[PDB]
Design a protein around this ligand. Structure first.
Ligand SMILES: */O=C(\[N][C]C1=[C][C]=C(F)[C]=[C]1)C1=[C]N([C][C])N=[C]1
Ligand SMILES: [Zn+2]
Length: 140
């Protein structure tokens, strides 16, 4: 579990979005595993605006933050998980590291702020849904 809180937006994995998220929907994209809802309170996070390929991510199934190198966001085949069938996911970054289903929502951060959230795992990789292209998160 986990979310990004930027301005008056809440960014969650689409597959973990709640009824209250869907009832207050700003934007969602199944191909990216992302959903954004509106918030009453302003959030503490800053979104990275950069092309870093190194950062640190939180792994709840280890209670640990790990430094990783990661691929640039791309259209990647993802094997079946507990929450999605095998499919192509877009805007996905991969790193070597541990990720189980409940790790989804852990933040990946670089020197510029939040890069994305954990979205995939298995076979010794962790996949992150990028948010650095969503420039509209930073206003309005
Ligand atoms: O519930 C609302 N939004 C989703 C949400 C927000 C915070 C959170 F911790 C979980 C889910 C919502 C939005 N608004 C209007 C701004 N009222 C309720
Ligand atoms: Zn960066």
């Amino acid at each position: 579990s986990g979310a990004i809180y930027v301005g008056n937006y809440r960014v969650v994995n689409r597959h973990l979005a709640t009824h209250n998220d869907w009832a207050n929907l700003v934007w969602e994209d199944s191909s990216r595993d992302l959903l954004v809802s509106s918030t009453t309170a302003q959030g503490c996070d800053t979104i990275a605006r950069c092309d870093c390929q190194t950062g640190v991510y939180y792994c709840s199934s280890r209670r640990k933050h790990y430094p990783v190198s990661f691929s640039k966001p791309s259209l990647i085949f993802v094997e079946a998980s507990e929450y999605y069938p095998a499919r192509y996911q877009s805007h996905l970054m991969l790193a070597v590291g541990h990720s189980e289903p409940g790790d989804c929502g852990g933040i990946l951060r670089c020197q510029h702020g939040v890069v994305g959230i954990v979205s995939t795992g298995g076979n010794g990789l962790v996949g992150f849904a990028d948010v650095r292209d969503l420039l509209w998160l930073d206003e309005e």
